[PDB]
Design a protein around this ligand. Structure first.
Ligand SMILES: [Fe+3]
Ligand SMILES: [Fe+3]
Ligand SMILES: [Fe+3]
Ligand SMILES: [Fe+3]
Ligand SMILES: [Fe+3]
Ligand SMILES: [Fe+3]
Ligand SMILES: [Fe+3]
Ligand SMILES: [Fe+3]
Lengths: 354, 353, 353, 354
């Protein structure tokens, strides 16, 4: 190492993303057992899914960050937060989770999905990486607004598939059901100079936000993007067997509603009639710092009285989940290492040193 | 544009995560008389700012952990091999963001290091400070940390070897150099150097120290990642320690590298502090832990043992001001939206949300 | 005598359950200067009494729920049908007693209705007040409540249509009419009127409002059964709200008709109140709930979010006096026996009991 | 004119009792499965029991209320409360639970039981209703003092059966064992002018209070009326297999002892050696407002150390319990409704409205 040879740029390039290609390697090397499926949490609502037949999907994989300076103290005119809250000042949304996966190291993938067109659910860098490293067979699947963003970034139209509610897509050995979204924020996320006083905007969900139910030989996973709470989760739950439900969670600032509360994660689990409920999105923003234990406590208090049939699962960014293998586990813990502890004797001044 | 993007342009546009947000925050902070403020920089990194505008970086670390699984073998005679008789690579992956850009540092009085372990000293932070700051900035640390800085190209004139019992004055702050209890450091030796040899047991002071930093708003004890020692009680008998920063984490089976939840409490009692603040518990995936153990045990024991201190649970990149924040137990980042409803919302109907 | 007894004679001698106990209690309460008292009449019914002896009844409901299972079908286009696409009868059975006989009311200044839903407005209470009280009593509510009262036979000189932004002076109390967030009310439309139509979304103010009642003892915010809205923060920014009354209950799967435990807390924070009081959680069997969820969440979050309010758990028929009772969390009905052992017991031996 | 046609009397008659005949209908229409029995909580200690053989019993069904005014300041001379506590002032006992069953709509019943002669355990209206609606076959079963009250009210002697400790009565397919009572309050519940200093009154339990063990093809239930705690429960538990134990609970005012404490509910369950303990009577009086969670918390703290073989069940007034089907359930929840949720599509201005 040399003080003189170091620049800010050389430091950044040698250091980030944090885990380098550790997880890229982990994912590629994982052998998914028959009648099971595996997923990894990529931060925010990003999920890598890998079926037993080696089909690979990336969903809402986001490699952006939040604010990088306080220099600009003003929020962009008509940003959704301004429309919802009548605010003027900059939002202090700072990214608080590491980047567990290098998208530029992706070699094996079948499709890139986006639940909706919000910035933290779609990514130009992920797009670039997949187009650069992968074959022409990889599909970009998302609602019309997501396809418009990808096309605008230079993704070829032939790579895109516009997801419409009620569509059923086959990719490798997995079935993708496109379902309604309840992302109320998406409804009012409109370009400057376009009015959100107008009631006609209320019919626009389908054009820009969907939920996905992904069916594998090991079971199904419901990715709700960042849908708020809706009674209509119960319609989805009546119609389909949903094994694992991924629901966005966070601590709403006073006067803001952007994520479901702890109580609504449970109501949503009950409405989806799932077996495992998995909060996500609760890792990403400093200003939404939260306490997932609220979900666990409320679940313990209410499960007998309401005869809840599901259990919560508390994950970690970069972590793996395998279903149905991990059903029954509640608290994820990263591999602790040292499985070969004391293979050989220690080298210490006396045995009881430590 | 999709074809104007490379891995390298993505990285340079994206990292570090918070840009210069906290650099700006720190500079623009006006520390009130009779108070001091600190920020947690990840791992055991701390920025301290006094009411006299003295600024110190302690253990500021801008490295990361493993970046690949390709090399499946642990380095021969790594401290973990010496303590555990293992052969396989350690899966230590960095799990906290980088809240401060070392290359945006403009205002600083000294760079301190508790010890020479990799996650407590940084060549990039050194480069940045040498490149952007005046000749007055000191690099303070045990002999072994000075040796690392020197070897990286930090000029001897900038360094101060910290030895136990030293009292250093920097601006309006007093830095007491105190004993370290980092048992891991004692056996962190180069390949070909034996850790069977009992003479290595006298080696703490040359490579590891703890700091008691006294300000006009109170004192902070930075324990580096010392393990538990009864000797904290000697430090606690000798000095008023307001805030104690102690390394915490979940030890893997057969490993002892961080103090347990019971020991964070015993150490707080021994240092006889006012506030105990676990840190280091953010950084490694394989040490993933539950700081609520500390809060639960403290609630169960504080009456019976007449504990006079309270714990405080922080967040990486977060601020703490003493004594202003005494009484606060759970840190929450600024939530934003303090001007909520300054104007009316623009919605299709008022109850839309 | 079994021969003289009829279902009718049984009912008339037995109900309402407390007879006129609370009517007497309320009438005889002398409210101290700079305080106000309220009683919970079940569901969201509130009796409010100021230090100046102004008396208001708010959402006083004396109906019951289902009385038979014979009719197995829900009325076409009932709000629950519109919201849930159901056909079967709702099993809403009233689970609270009737602590106040409306036909014993003799002293009152105004009858308020937050909205026109059946369990918030009452023809029997209207009859009773017109029968027993002077020409001066006002019936205050949104246009839709005034229309219901008018159609029942309440004279038009008695009614006052509440519009958002109105400020009504009644005796020594000020009544601010504020926005409601009762999303169910928006779709509660007559058979043959479409709820697919987006124009219905502008209809809140004509049929539902929230009240902020200001007294010399402080203020109370009655939210009717508003759902959760960010706009509570606008009301909280604009006014000092001491006590917030918020409707709570356990929503059946696929139904949203009451705020969750998490939202009771968010609403308390948004209203920036000092005391939050769930109500409505007593009334329907099919919404049977656990208010302790609110207490547990509040304990878990109050430090981290710096909550400045505390929850208060009431009982139907109970009293609350503000600010005298601030600090109390769990209401207990009077236990009696204050004159215990005034005289000696009459027992076969001292230690019998 | 709606308001013109309304009187206090018309309102009361159109409104009460609260559930009308909903529960009358529910009970009649219930088909009890073989090897099970069902019960409903009627408020206070009232129970409706229905066997698989369609035998129907009412136990301590009380349709009275408490105080209806504050005007009478004084407690009745020599009321049991005055004898026990040397008090003068009126007791503030206000009924706090609704009336889930209309006694006048009873059409199918085999017997009317009373555990003891306290006012809240026997009812003249229930008697009048049963005599008016049912055949000559319906029996009124109670201790001598209960039979005396029924007789005095006009119940014909031929309908009554004086229950004495040790008696075993057959009614349909159920066996009713009459057992000792421990209602200490009943011993000093004596008419004005009769002395409670007299030790002879101590032999009076059996003539006025009993406990019942009701054996069905689905298991047994022990109704303790409002017995206080007694070591003698262990005698009953040694002698018989007791599946469900119904025990009176409440919050005693300072200086009063009228209901078992949370600790004693547990000791009693242990003594009776039951499988399920069900507190009751804790719904009825305002001045005894209590917290049944004390029972649950204590049980969780002690069940391992004491090797408790029973579990508590927390019911709701008007609710159902079926044994052994409901064993394992701890917190009763009334039917929530909406089982046909989303049978059809909602009728809303946009899907995510709710
Ligand atoms: Fe998002
Ligand atoms: Fe979104
Ligand atoms: Fe370390
Ligand atoms: Fe160390
Ligand atoms: Fe209501
Ligand atoms: Fe309503
Ligand atoms: Fe009783
Ligand atoms: Fe009794």
């Amino acid at each position: 190492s040399k003080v003189n040879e170091i620049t800010r740029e050389s430091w950044i390039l040698s250091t980030f993303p944090e885990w380098g290609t550790w997880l890229n390697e982990e994912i590629e090397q994982t052998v998914v057992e028959p009648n099971t499926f595996s997923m990894w949490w990529l931060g925010c609502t990003g999920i890598w899914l890998k079926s037993a037949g080696n089909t690979n999907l990336s969903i809402d994989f986001w490699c952006g960050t939040g604010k990088k300076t306080q220099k600009n103290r003003l929020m962009n005119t008509q940003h959704q937060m301004m429309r919802m809250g009548g605010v003027e000042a900059l939002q202090p949304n700072l990214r608080t989770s590491i980047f567990p996966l290098d998208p530029f190291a992706i070699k094996e993938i079948d499709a890139v999905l986006a639940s909706h067109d919000h910035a933290d659910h779609i990514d130009v860098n992920v797009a670039a990486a997949v187009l650069q490293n992968c074959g022409e067979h990889v599909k970009f699947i998302g609602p019309q607004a997501c396809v418009d963003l990808w096309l605008g970034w230079g993704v070829p139209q032939e790579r895109c598939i516009v997801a419409k509610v009620g569509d059923v897509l086959e990719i490798g050995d997995v079935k993708i059901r496109v379902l309604d979204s309840f992302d109320r924020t998406a409804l009012v996320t409109l370009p400057k100079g376009v009015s959100s006083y107008d009631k006609a905007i209320l019919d626009g969900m389908d054009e820009r936000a969907v939920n996905y139910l992904i069916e594998t030989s090991g079971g199904s996973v419901y990715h709700s993007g960042d849908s708020h709470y809706s009674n209509y989760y119960a319609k989805h739950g009546n119609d389909y067997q949903i094994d694992v439900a991924l629901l966005s969670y966070g601590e709403n600032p006073r006067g803001v509603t952007d994520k479901m509360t702890s109580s609504d994660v449970l109501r949503a689990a009950e409405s989806l009639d799932c077996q495992v409920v998995v909060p996500f999105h609760h890792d990403i923003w400093a200003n939404f710092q939260n306490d997932p234990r609220e979900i666990e406590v409320l679940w313990n208090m209410k499960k007998d009285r309401l005869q809840y049939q599901f259990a919560p699962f508390f994950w970690q960014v970069g972590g793996k989940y395998t279903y149905p293998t991990d059903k029954g586990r509640m608290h994820y813990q990263h591999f602790r290492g040292f499985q070969d502890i004391f293979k050989n004797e220690p080298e210490l001044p006396y045995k009881a040193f430590l």
